[PDB]
Amino acid sequence: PPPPEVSPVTGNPVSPHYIHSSTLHFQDVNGRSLVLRGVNLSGSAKHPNNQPSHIREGFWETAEAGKGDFINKPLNLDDGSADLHLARLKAWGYNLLRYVFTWESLEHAGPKEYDYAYMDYIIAVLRKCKEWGFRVFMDPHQDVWSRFTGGSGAPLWTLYACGIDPYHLTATAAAYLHCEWPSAESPKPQDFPAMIWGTNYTHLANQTIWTFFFAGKTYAPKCIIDGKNIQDFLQDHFIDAVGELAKRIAEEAGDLLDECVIGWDSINEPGEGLIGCKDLAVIPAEQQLKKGPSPTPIEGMRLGMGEAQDVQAWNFGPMGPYRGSRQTIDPKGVKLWLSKEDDVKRGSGKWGWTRGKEWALGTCIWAHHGVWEIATSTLLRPDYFSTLPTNPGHQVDFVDDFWALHWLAYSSRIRLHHPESIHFIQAPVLRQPPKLPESFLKGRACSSPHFYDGLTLMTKHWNWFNADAIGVIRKKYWSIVQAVRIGEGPIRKMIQGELAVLKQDTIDILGNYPTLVGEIGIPYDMDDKKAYGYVDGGRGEGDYSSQQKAMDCSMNACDGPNCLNYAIWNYVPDNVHEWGDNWNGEDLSLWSVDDKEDSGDFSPTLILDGSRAVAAFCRPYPVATVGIPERIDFDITSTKFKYAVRVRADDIANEQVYTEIYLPFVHYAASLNAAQLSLDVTIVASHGRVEIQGQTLRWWYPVPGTGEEVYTIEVQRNGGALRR
């Protein structure tokens, strides 16, 4: 069966730019299989202007004042720079953008005080993306709940709504903030340990807030606010805020829908809080992220009541976390919990909600629900969060029982304002998605997991070894040593196998839908920033060999038999060598000003200058295919490219319906000296005819008279690889 002429969601006829998301591959209206590849734009939208993660001055004051100046991130629309960035991304062959926005940027002023101006800024950015021919899906983005709890996402007033005093987070170790590390009194942000920001998910603030968000009605029934459980208060305000952006786009720029904005991602990498914790007295060996001081859930609660604790600290070794020394954390009586007087002054009383009388303030909310006894520090219900407190034999599943329920509410709101929206389903990190009902999917969905080469990300080193982290997580190996691989070949094949597992989750669970890797990337600040000239007397500056191999391994993993859609994390216009992406020590931008100095009518400087390891992320691939993509192989050193496609007898092929392949000047240009750029390639196709224009290869062929047959096309630069 070919793609239908009417939407499976509404039954209305579809525009000619409609992308079907009803089978294992995206399809255009003429039946061509589409591959969408691009970048996340942008991590820089995680924080307001002039307040990067490492700067404490102004951090609290602007948010307490209800401000949130995010205008002109990710792209500045006043200085002309916005078109140059989009031109670069398009010239690299990208046709997809995962657009990053935060709840904070929409509702920083207070509950239901929406920043309509930032909404209109986003619309203006989306309009330019459309002019440049991008497809876009929207990412409501967060990391460890909010900037105020170590990352990005929610507005500061959500902390007060949860009864948390933001100024006591550091003293109690309830969250590690980059700008208050190692202490608020004497910050040394440059010493912030690599990737420690992620452990905030397993410290007390995130552990509480996420339990509220997804399951407050089950585990914190006394937490009433505006006559609602905190769970509904938080979820309703988040869904309303995203819903107001969607409504704004639908009412003020409806032309963006479906032609440019094709769908919406669900809440980014949601935290699980304490839900499913089997034993509050221990950190499970299965928890894969441990680094720095790591209080157990009960140790963190005692800390949140101001009691000093001696906590295990963890180092990240070649085979994962291993124990270091124990470290004493002494809050010296400081408590995480808002006092009542502070709630009147800075919380409920200021932001304008009414807190219920059984919501005890200034003391641990989990003790208040009987989890532990403060006087004796006795854990009373170690398994409290593993079952339902009032029907305690039943064991809970975070993804099926709480995440999925939030997703029904979220997805319904999206469709209210965007009737043809593709649901990009992002299950919680490292979990399989739940089975979701067709009454909500309605044949218009796409699985959007994230995948990172975790060893490379955490160690900021391209290692000569690696390990199959997904297979370990999923108990496919009897010992972790049999998950280990050595050498480029075995490592690449193993990572490609990991991406195949995620592809398989989709068809096993959700159905015959596409898969898109919503985030994938590598760190560029490897080797103590040797590529930036920061060590060894400057030796190694500009040499991105290691970043290139790491990048190429992750990108190759989306090729092979996987042939995946994906969005690279990320593209950051204001990335710098000193502070990276300006967020928690991460440096994953493809491009940096510090690295400066269909047409070939632009300069090689656009696609090369400022780029890092461009040879690995700018790659040939089929944008649109008559038939089904079967296999992609690309080798940087030889430039050899081979594409195999399964073509059936009922596929549609003619002079206007053909396969289109992107061939980058980066790999295939005759010359890249800073006079029009032009491809100099040899092409071998098993069937049909081809012609090249600019960076585009067009491939016409007849379908088989019967059955199905694999056609192939091979490309390489005449005379081998360039030197860039």
Residue numbers in the entry: 2 to 598, 645 to 721, 782 to 831
Paper text:
C. neoformans sterylglucosidase 1 (Sgl1), the first gene/protein identified with a sterylglucosidase activity, converts erg-glc to ergosterol and glucose. Sgl1 is an ideal pharmacological target with broad spectrum since Sgl1 is widely conserved in fungi and there is no obvious homolog in humans.
Screening of three deletion constructs identified one deletion, C. neoformans Sgl1 Δ723–777, that did not affect Sgl1 activity towards erg-glc and yielded crystals that diffracted to 2.1 Å resolution. One arm of the Y-shaped cavity is lined with hydrophobic residues and is buried within the protein structure, which would limit the size of molecules that can fit in this cavity. The unique active sites of Sgl1 and Cerezyme suggest that selective inhibitors targeting Sgl1 would not inhibit Cerezyme. In support of this, binding of a Tris molecule in the active site of Sgl1 resulted in the Tris molecule adopting a different conformation than that of a Tris molecule previously observed in the active site of Cerezyme13.
